[PDB]
């Protein structure tokens, strides 16, 4: 019917992940990369899981889709391009995530 906002639906939030010594999470998927085992028709980037419960513990959740990173769009891009971008970033890494909604 219309765009959602103040209700249960596809939201758009940002997260601040400071690298010290590193981010603390892995990424999967990508257009032409190794592939993502979460979505069949979607070849985007997903945060499969987290190891250290500190940097991306309360920020990012397992199985989330990354829409944008530090201004660089992560849609329709190749995996190798996504990883290279995340690694080159300075200390504080600002990212945008979204939670799907389908009943």
């Amino acid at each position: 019917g219309s765009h959602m906002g103040h209700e249960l639906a596809k939201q758009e939030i940002r997260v601040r992940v400071e690298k010290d010594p590193e981010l603390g999470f892995s990424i999967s998927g990508g257009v032409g990369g190794r592939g993502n085992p979460f979505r069949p028709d979607d070849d985007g980037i997903f945060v499969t899981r987290v190891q250290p419960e500190g940097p991306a513990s309360k920020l990012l959740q397992p199985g989330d889709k990354i829409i944008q990173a530090n201004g660089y769009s992560f849609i329709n891009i190749e995996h190798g391009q996504a990883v290279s971008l995340l690694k080159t970033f300075q200390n504080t890494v600002e990212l945008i995530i979204v939670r799907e909604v389908s009943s």
Partner: peptide, 7 residues
């Protein structure tokens, strides 16, 4: 298999 990459 390999697919997950830790950044």
């Amino acid at each position: 298999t390999g697919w997950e990459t830790w950044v």
